[model samples]
Target: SSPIFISTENLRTILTHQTLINHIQSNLPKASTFLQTPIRQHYNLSPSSSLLLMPSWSSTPSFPYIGVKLVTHFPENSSQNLPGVQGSYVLFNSTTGQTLASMDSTELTLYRTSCVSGLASKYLARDDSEILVMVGAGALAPHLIKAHFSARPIVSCATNALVKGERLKVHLDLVGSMKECDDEALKRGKVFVDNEAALVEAGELVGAFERGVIKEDEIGGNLLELIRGDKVGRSSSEEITVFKSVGSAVVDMLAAQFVYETYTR
Candidate 1:
């Protein structure tokens, strides 16, 4: 069959956050089982822009697929009234190594990235959690908020802009620090991230890591460990919880596979 092409709208029609999370749960293990090369970054393009390549595959026969995503980040996109992140995903048949489909990475990244936060929240956030505080109200903010709501019963939300820099003034119950926020709040919460290495670039977590406010060994667990049940999530109702994400290629690959399978079916 010829390679299929999926637009952002079609991807939305065929996938929902709940369904995407289900697929992410199932595929995360496969990604770990058949780990591909480490994620690669190319940065000679510009001072504030670079390209990312994420590749992974499933080893099992039930769904033998391989995929890669080519993503770019331009910090100046806001002035141009465009999205800061944009990319494309390509899926292939691992058996024949043939191209299977190409998808719009914008929506794919949005859902998959937030689903990762949702997955982490499943283990990290309180079941009765009722408040969600977002640090940045960017494109991913709404998606991340909704995804976390899917994992827990969050009903109230606050943003740094809305709260007027008082995010740390009040005790937050559930926090998703999409960007660098109050260091005090982060230190007071049970933090989880999509990947530790990638998040180091954020400065918030890195500062905490360097200052020993939080130990490298005290990071609880990453998405892979959380999904595999190797680590624990929330421990108390009153305990604060945080999930940080720097994005991952394995997630992109799994998302592409889900969209491809759903569309082809």
Candidate 2:
């Protein structure tokens, strides 16, 4: 059978933050049960560039699917007028071993990463959460903001109310610029992370840990544990919550399956 090919434009038209969140949440029970090899990172032949290979497969036979995302990072791409990160997804039917689809990984990454955060927020953020403070203004910022909005009742960013000292219900540090927010906001918030290893390098969790601002034991939980129901998220309505994400392969796999299912149906 011919494999379905999904372009960035096509994906944008079909998949929304809300739909992606649904897929992620519905697949949460399987997330811990799924099989995922450790992320493989290597330097490209070009200096200062690298490649990442993430592969995962669902063990459940009823909804079997296997996939991998191959992403490349070239810091010089900006100077070349191209996106710094680019990749694609290859999906296969787990039972029949048939190629099912090849899709735009960049688009997949945006949705999956944000949806993972959204999934975390479901358990982490307060039900009545209103304010969402986005630290970065990059491509991933809007996706992250929208994902959180889908999971919670966020009205807007903290810009309008930052001076008013309004309580921040959910704070999303997209670019790792944790210091950009006021100390009071960061201090009052409960920190949630995507992956400890990835967040250490990409976000403010590590820096906060080092500065004695956030204690290791103080962390509420990460996505894996939260999804697996191994840990609880928020305990009080007045509590502030933060979700930090670097990225994950399992998320990419689930997202690829969602795209395939949507296109085929």
Candidate 3:
């Protein structure tokens, strides 16, 4: 039989935050239970790369999506311009021998990473949290901003570096300043600050976009460095803490399982 093809463009047309959130919430309870069983194994090819293969034996009629993913280290040379991590996923039909889909997962991985981050913030972040401090100005920054807002309402900082730490005292007035010369531009758009910070960034803020450091305001402390010293999981209810996750084969497996079920039935 000819293989059924799902184009990336068509796949994107169906992928949305609402749809993903619904799928994720439906799977979370069972996934949490599945995580309790020991079924994951990791094999490393080199210091810079590795493969994770997780096989979940879910007792269900629908096909369970099982697959392996390759993860590679982020390159420093492309820290500013190119993305940090790169990888792909191989998805298959569990019951059939068919190779259903192979995805160029770099963008999908980052998007899923941000989605989980938003999910964590939704369940974990402070209910009254309103101040949002971003450390980077890059592609991921825009997504992060959107995800954070998706979970909670907050203000944004300046994207410029000229003014530092002057929250609320000043806003990003450059666009308005430009509008003074171009009346048509002013009519076309207006500037507004949703957060206290003016969306500004320093070289230090670069990590939010790359696989690098986290600014002080981005998190209370260095989670990667302090994971050993601090509690591995939940420490407090009052203090909201969020750890940004890079995408993994584990999440892919979960997502693939959902997709396969939908495809077959």
**TM-score of each predicted structure versus truth:** 0.82, 0.80, 0.52
| lDDT (Cα, 0-100) at 254 in candidate 3 | 59
Worst 10 residues of 1 by lDDT: 155-164
Supply candidate 1's per-residue lDDT for 219: 71
- Per-residue lDDT tens digits of candidate 3, residues 81-148? 75445655566555664566655455555445555455544544455545665644744566555666
Predict model 1's lDDT versus the native: 0.69
Candidate 3: residue 225 Cα off by (Å): 24
- Give model 1's TM-score versus the native structure: 0.82
Candidate that beats the other on TM-score, 1 or 2, i.e. the better one: 1
lDDT of candidate 2 over 1-265, digit per residue (tens):
9898998888888888888888777775576466555656666857778887777776568668888778899878889788878889999888888989999888888778777777776777666555665643567778877877888863223221222125443334332232334434457756667766655664345665667876788777777787767877777766666666666666677778788888878
On a 0 to 100 scale, what is the lDDT of residue 78 in model 2?
82
**Ten contiguous residues minimizing lDDT sum, candidate 2:** 156-165
Residues 50-104, model 1: lDDT tens digits: 8877777765666688887788889698689887778898898988889999987
